[PDB]
Design a protein around this ligand. Structure first.
Ligand SMILES: [Zn+2]
Length: 1036
């Protein structure tokens, strides 16, 4: 017997996918424990190997065989045989199928059947997931019947002559079609043999199969004897059974109105005389005028005028001041009033809403096309003003509709200042605009920015200014490392800022001489490992640089004067120097006292009551509480293990382990607002079934001052209203609207600003602006703030009109990722923070700095309590271990014997992955011969090839990849193995990768703990945001 394995057939079949199902699954031998076998047939069947990888039916033999090297299992629904035959166009799991059969469809109705060791199985319509592995079998059957209708090289020429119109077309190339025929040989040879029996085509095909021999087998006779247990991978596993029903979200009448209106309107449903007297004179001695006539209509400071434009739509300018030119000219100054449609909002903005901008313009009075009605909205803020705002909104909308019906001029309103450079909508400086004093604040800002572009040397000849930063003699500066003169291995060759001491300014328009400081990583990687992050080595290397190669200023002190407080995400540009590094010998020595280097010399209750929606294990809440800005008094979490973990880590919190929509409905029912609720009847029934004690502790408007959390947006095409109605972002925005918190921090994945052609982001911004918020957005990479796991997160800050929008934390660690840009419109882009790829104050955190001291554990552990065996060595271990003396959650997911063998066979070299496993039939101590190489990708499809990272180890000096949120030791494992040990990353190691302190505790199964760790904002990034918010909170 001759068989062809996956190497040749892999071209036609798609990329290998894996089988998943629900908990409904029963054994097969127990149903029928015991040629003349039961003929039970199958619905929604599927086939797989021992790794639950979908496998073509072509890999099973035709006759009896004593030993079948390839093991194959199946699943489906066992049902009564009805003699269903195919011509064109309770759940069970099978045992090791021993063969398969084509039944001769004399009336062109050929069927499909399989034989396990117990009973026959006729095959019906398969599962939709297995259809890609099902269609090629039908295609080759159609080819076989086409040749049968026709009746070796003559046949190949005949079938190559056919074009793509016929269903039995393969390819016009003789060689490719011959390869296709020889690859699917037995599937045609047996079909021809069951009809001609000794036709030359048959013997030619057999000869070709021998020419492409890949596996021999022995044909035998009746050997049925039940001597197997089940050996099925599916047997014994408990599948995930949640698939929570996406019920319609509970929303307020405002958010629902906005989203429904958007998805229903779109988606697949002259005399120029003055007026008055001058109130003063400008600096240039020009008259200052407040009011003027234009073509019979009015123009005044604080109003808006229109400028004639070439087509398109006229531009609107907010008048700042009016003056008469020296040559008796009527001229005015205005600020650009961007229309809502041209901002990042796009089509999700009202027609009547305009946004102030920093761009200014100056023009003659006679160039005005006309004056448009324009008012500034200053509605009061607070939860108690929501009903009045709703009534005013309805009245204004009715008035606008009435005016549009009678084709009257549109009345505009402005309530936000759109700054794309800062990337957000801010509050209007009502006391700084429309001053009519002849001074434009935006013009002053532009002039100041222009002044921040010149390399000017001060009169003292001992310093200069660059980028608005003053440099002086004896200061400490940053120099780009270049200016001096694998997936895991991202930060493998990136150097931090070169710290230098600027000694003398030598003119050349001048160059600066700087003495060099040497970082620990310059000596060796091991020295950088066992040393502080903020340590510098003194040296006597002086280099001359242009003044444009200086990035900032820092401080350098001794060990005695270093600050006592040590926050983990370091926001202080402070280093300490104690040792001397000699480049000639590379030897570190003590600092001699002969020179005595001139080092740097020293010379409330704002905590906000917090409601944390979708809290999870509490990473964001812990980070914000460590920064002294959040209380985490209330939390809401659907998942039971996540709520348990939150209650474990935050005992003082009040955790609601319930649906967000149900909790919102209960809150809005307690407050007395039922007519403002858009909720399903199921939500009403669930909310009505709540303990009175729980309803007594529910939050109410006025008791919440900070709402934070990340909604689980499904995203992923322009979905209709009936599909976007069930998203949790609507419930989150309804929470924000009803409670009216002073601050609102939304967190989501990087692709949040691109879901549904970016409509979700625009709609979120539109809802937040309709509420009356100041909204800013950005994308932050957690890897640049201390963690060793790259994670890009989109953050949206929202603040009350009278509050201050927090700034974005400055990245302080090197990370090789370009600027993270959000595209607004008109080719404009916004970057939240600078890309610390070519330079940063501190070196990147490596894997060894994170998991280099934890005790070793074998593959699969359950001991949740252990003791440390090695003292903390690096800076990260010392900082994250703290005073903890009991190691918790140091357990790893247990892999089967085959996966353990595969992991042990992976070499402990950087960049190693599944490409390094040897090709050999392995045999674990179970009687199950298996292929060692996990995947068999097609030779073609280069883009769909190069599957690097799967079964991949971690580089010691690399960083944790993004693909370790939920390690899965069944199919596509990914880059999750340990750098040195033969195991998957433990829960504690994954927590340390995200910056979770060793004192943090997780709850639930290992899968639940990993899901909590992967779904939480890193406590480092959360703490950085918290301290930025604390800085913003002290201004007000
Ligand atoms: Zn201006």
């Amino acid at each position: 017997y001759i068989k062809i394995n996956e190497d040749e057939i892999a071209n036609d079949y798609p990329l290998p996918s894996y089988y998943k199902t629900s908990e409904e699954e029963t054994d097969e031998l127990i149903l029928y424990d015991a040629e003349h076998l039961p003929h039970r047939m199958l619905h929604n069947w599927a086939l797989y190997n021992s790794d639950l990888r979908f496998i073509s039916l072509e890999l099973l033999p035709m006759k009896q065989c004593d030993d079948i090297d390839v093991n194959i299992f199946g699943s489906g629904v066992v049902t009564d045989d009805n003699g269903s035959w195919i011509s064109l166009n309770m759940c069970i799991f099978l045992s090791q199928i021993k063969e398969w059969m084509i039944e001769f469809g004399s009336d062109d109705i050929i069927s499909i059947s399989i034989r396990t060791d117990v009973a026959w199985y006729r095959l019906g319509k398969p599962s939709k997931l297995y259809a890609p592995w099902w269609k090629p079998v039908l295609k080759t059957a159609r080819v076989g019947i086409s040749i049968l209708t026709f009746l070796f090289a003559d046949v190949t020429k005949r079938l190559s002559g056919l074009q793509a119109n016929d269903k039995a077309y393969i390819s016009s190339d003789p060689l490719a079609v011959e390869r296709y025929l020889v690859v699917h040989g037995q599937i045609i040879l047996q079909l021809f043999a069951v009809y001609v029996k000794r036709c030359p085509f048959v013997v030619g095909l057999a000869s070709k199969l021998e020419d492409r021999h890949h596996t021999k087998w022995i044909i035998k006779k009746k050997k049925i004897s039940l001597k197997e247990l089940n050996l099925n991978p599916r047997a014994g596993m408990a599948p995930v059974a949640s698939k929570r029903k996406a019920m319609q979200a509970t929303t307020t009448r405002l958010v629902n109105r906005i989203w429904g209106e958007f998805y229903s309107n779109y988606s697949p449903e002259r005399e120029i005389k003055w007026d008055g007297e001058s109130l003063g004179k400008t600096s240039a001695g020009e008259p200052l005028y407040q009011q003027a006539l234009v073509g019979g209509e009015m123009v005044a400071v604080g109003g808006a005028v229109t400028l004639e434009v070439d087509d398109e739509m006229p531009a609107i300018y907010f008048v700042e001041y009016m003056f008469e030119s020296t040559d008796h000219c009527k001229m005015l100054h205005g600020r650009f009033l961007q229309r809502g449609s041209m901002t990042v909002l796009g089509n999700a903005a009202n027609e009547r809403e305009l946004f102030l901008t920093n761009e200014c313009m100056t023009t003659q009075l006679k160039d005005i096309k006309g004056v448009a009605s324009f008012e500034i909205r200053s509605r009061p803020w607070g939860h108690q003003y929501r009903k009045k705002n709703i009534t005013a909104d309805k009245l204004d909308w009715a008035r606008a509709l009435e005016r549009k019906v009678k084709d009257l001029p549109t009345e505009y309103y402005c309530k936000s200042l759109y700054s794309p450079e800062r990337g957000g909508f801010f509050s209007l400086p009502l006391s700084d605009i429309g001053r009519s004093s002849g001074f434009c604040t935006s013009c002053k800002i532009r002039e100041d920015e222009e002044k921040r572009s010149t390399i000017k040397l001060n009169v003292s000849k001992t310093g200069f200014f660059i980028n608005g930063i003053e440099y002086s003699v004896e200061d400490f500066v940053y120099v780009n490392p270049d200016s001096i003169g694998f997936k895991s291995g991202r930060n493998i060759g990136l150097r931090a800022y070169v710290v230098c001491q600027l000694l003398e300014i030598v003119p050349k328009s001048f160059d600066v001489k700087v003495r060099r400081f040497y970082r620990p990583e310059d000596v060796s990687a091991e020295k950088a490992y066992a040393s502080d992050i903020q340590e510098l080595y003194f040296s006597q290397d002086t280099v001359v640089l242009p003044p444009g190669a200086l990035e900032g200023k820092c401080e350098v002190r001794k060990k005695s004067d270093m600050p006592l407080s040590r926050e983990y995400p370091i926001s202080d540009h402070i280093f300490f120097c104690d040792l001397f590094f000699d480049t000639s010998k590379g030897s570190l020595k003590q600092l001699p006292a002969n020179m005595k280097p001139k080092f740097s010399t020293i010379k409330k209750e704002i905590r906000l009551a917090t409601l944390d929606i979708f809290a999870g294990c509490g990473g964001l809440s812990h980070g914000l509480k460590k920064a002294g800005v959040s209380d985490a008094k209330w939390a809401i979490e659907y998942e039971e293990p996540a709520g348990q973990a939150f209650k474990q880590n935050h005992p003082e919190s009040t955790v609601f382990v319930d649906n967000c929509n149900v909790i919102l409905r209960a809150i809005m029912e307690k407050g007395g607002d039922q007519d403002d609720c858009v909720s399903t009847t199921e939500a009403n029934e669930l909310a009505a079934k709540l303990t009175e004690e729980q309803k007594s502790t529910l939050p109410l408007p006025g008791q919440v001052d900070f709402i934070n959390g990340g909604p689980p947006c499904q995203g992923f095409n322009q979905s209709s209203w009936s599909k976007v109605q069930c998203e949790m972002i609507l419930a989150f925005l309804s929470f924000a609207d009803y409670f009216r918190p002073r601050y609102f921090l939304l967190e989501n994945v990087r692709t949040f600003v691109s879901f549904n052609k970016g409509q979700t982001f625009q709609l979120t911004l539109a809802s937040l602006l309709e509420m009356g918020y100041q909204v800013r957005f950005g994308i932050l990479e957690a890897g640049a703030y201390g963690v060793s796991q790259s994670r890009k997160r989109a953050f949206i800050w929202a603040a009350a009109p009278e509050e201050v929008l927090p700034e974005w934390p400055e990245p302080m660690h090197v990370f090789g990722v370009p600027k993270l840009k959000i595209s607004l419109s008109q080719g404009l882009h916004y970057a939240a923070v600078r890309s610390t790829a070519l330079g940063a104050p501190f070196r990147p955190i490596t894997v060894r700095d994170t998991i280099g001291d934890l005790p070793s554990v074998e593959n699969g552990d359950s001991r949740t309590n252990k003791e440390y065996k090695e003292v903390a060595v690096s800076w990260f271990q010392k900082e994250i271990r703290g005073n903890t003396i009991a190691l918790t959650d140091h357990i790893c997911k247990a892999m089967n014997e085959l996966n353990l063998i595969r992991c042990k066979l992976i070499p402990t070299r950087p960049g190693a992955d599944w490409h390094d496993l040897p090709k050999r039939k392995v045999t674990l101590s179970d009687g199950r011969v298996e292929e060692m190489i996990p995947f068999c990708l097609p030779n073609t499809a280069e883009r769909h090839n190069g599957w690097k990272g799967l079964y991949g180890r971690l580089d010691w000096q690399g960083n944790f990849p993004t693909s370790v949120t939920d390690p899965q030791p069944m199919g596509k494992v990914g880059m999750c193995f340990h750098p040195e040990q033969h195991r998957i990353l433990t829960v504690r190691e994954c927590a340390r990768s995200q910056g979770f302190p060793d004192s943090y505790e997780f709850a639930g199964n290992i899968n639940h703990k990993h899901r909590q760790i992967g779904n939480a904002v890193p406590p480092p990034l959360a703490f950085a945001l918290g301290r930025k918010l604390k800085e913003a909170l002290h201004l007000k």
